[PDB]
């Protein structure tokens, strides 16, 4: 869909070479413009890596020239990034973008998270957070879902598959040791829960894990 | 390597009020061909950067009159006539006349609004986790403002603890409030020794802290 798309591993062991793909939809990557690769480090810090022009010409950021390489497949209308000898410092969000700096044409992709670590991929454990007593005859009621010790990022969390969007807060994951813990809360009027079903759906792309957890009461 | 400096680092504006951001480059961005390649980007929470202005002052399509860019040589200014809720996010400044192209450290813009008290919620471990031999007490502090807030955990009296994971959310674009999650992780044996679990939040919206706890004697 959309216009630009990044695809690639989400985990890469240090010392090996990273390889990302940007599939371009809606415009020919041979017609015009520069197709770059930008990455965002944990801190909002942006770094332009390199580009490949519609004519095949490349430009690389000197801080990377030695281990960077950019290619393309004009038939499948997509370009690639090959970064060799990665380290945990190469961990960051990778974006592919197109622009020429002087005309209206400017498009960024959605970006992919690429973490470099020797750690092993591990599914997330999902636990239900039901109110302990609280109030039944009350305006609202907040429920919760805890996603304990997974790796690597990211994890996706939705309630009832998307039905509930308002009153939903999914908190930034916190890493401890070599695992990630993240939670998500949702506030629903006392009318629905515990009557109607409220399910917590979390998915872990990296491990092809997907789980639905129903928020069941207990009260007292 | 050309540095781009932006100021302020953070900017707190009330809706409707005007705002302006500054960008300084280590070298003149004027190109021999007369043009100066400087662009402005906005990165809204959970999204990728979006270009708003190019060639110092040309607005990209879909961008509102409210945004104006100006300057020359080394100093540039992004200005918003009237700030809107949807304008929250981080603003980047980027140059493209010198190789390699460089970005600014960004400027975070937060919508200022009335102070708000947080809604506290505590959760004892779930049997499901307990069997796994562990136990986590979770405390949610939702929709408060300002972001400044302190949480303390107390097991069996003021005996505070340390081994808790805190996480703040970006400012919601919906109601301009923040939310925080605080998780206390204890082993099951440790958890079954003590009796009272207290979540204490201090906020400037009050002198006495908002307290939420439970004793191990329920479901």
């Amino acid at each position: 869909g959309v216009q630009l798309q990044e695809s690639g591993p989400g985990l890469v062991k240090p010392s090996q070479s990273l390889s990302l793909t940007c599939t371009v939809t809606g415009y020919s990557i041979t017609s015009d413009y520069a197709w770059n690769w930008i990455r965002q480090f944990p801190g909002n810090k942006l770094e332009w890596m390199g580009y490949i022009t519609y004519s095949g010409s490349t430009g690389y950021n000197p801080s990377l020239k030695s281990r960077i390489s950019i290619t393309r497949d004009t038939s499948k209308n997509q370009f690639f990034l090959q970064l060799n000898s990665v380290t945990t410092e190469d961990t960051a969000t990778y974006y592919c973008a197109s622009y020429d700096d002087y005309t209206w044409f400017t498009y960024w992709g959605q970006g992919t998270l690429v973490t470099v670590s020797a750690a092993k991929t591990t599914p997330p454990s999902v636990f239900p957070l039901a109110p302990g007593s609280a109030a039944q005859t009350n305006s609202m009621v907040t429920l919760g879902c805890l996603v304990k010790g997974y790796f690597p990022e990211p994890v996706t969390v939705t309630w009832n598959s998307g039905s509930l969007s308002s009153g939903v807060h999914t908190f930034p994951a916190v890493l401890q040791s070599d695992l990630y813990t993240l939670s998500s809360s949702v506030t629903v009027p006392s009318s629905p829960r515990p009557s109607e079903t409220v399910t917590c759906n979390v998915a872990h792309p990296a491990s092809s894990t997907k789980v639905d957890k129903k928020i069941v009461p207990r009260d007292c | 390597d050309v540095q781009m400096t932006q100021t302020p680092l953070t900017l707190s504006v009330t809706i409707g009020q005007p705002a302006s951001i500054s960008c300084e480059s280590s070298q003149s961005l004027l190109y021999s061909n007369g043009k100066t390649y400087l662009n402005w980007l906005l990165q809204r929470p959970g999204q990728s950067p979006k270009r708003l202005i190019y060639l110092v002052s040309k607005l990209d399509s879909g961008v509102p009159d409210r945004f104006t860019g100006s300057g020359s040589g080394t100093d540039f200014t992004l200005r918003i006539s009237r700030v809107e809720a949807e304008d929250l996010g981080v603003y980047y400044c980027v140059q493209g006349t010198h190789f390699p192209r460089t970005f600014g450290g960004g400027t975070k813009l937060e919508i200022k609004r009335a102070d708000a008290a947080p809604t506290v919620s505590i959760f004892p471990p779930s049997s499901e986790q307990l069997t796994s031999g562990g136990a986590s007490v979770v405390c949610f502090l939702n929709n408060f403002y300002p972001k400044d807030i302190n949480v303390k955990w107390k097991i069996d009296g003021s005996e505070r603890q340390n081994g808790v994971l805190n996480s703040w959310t970006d400012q919601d674009s919906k109601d301009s409030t923040y939310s925080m999650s605080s998780t206390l992780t204890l082993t099951k044996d440790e958890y079954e020794r003590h009796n009272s679990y207290t979540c204490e939040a201090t906020h400037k919206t009050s002198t006495s802290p908002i307290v939420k706890s439970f004793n191990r004697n329920e479901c």
Binding site: T53, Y54, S57, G59, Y99, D100, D101 | N33, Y37, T97
Partner: peptide
């Protein structure tokens, strides 16, 4: 060298 030139040379 700027993209405006690179892309038109």
């Amino acid at each position: 060298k700027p993209l405006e030139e690179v892309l038109n040379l």
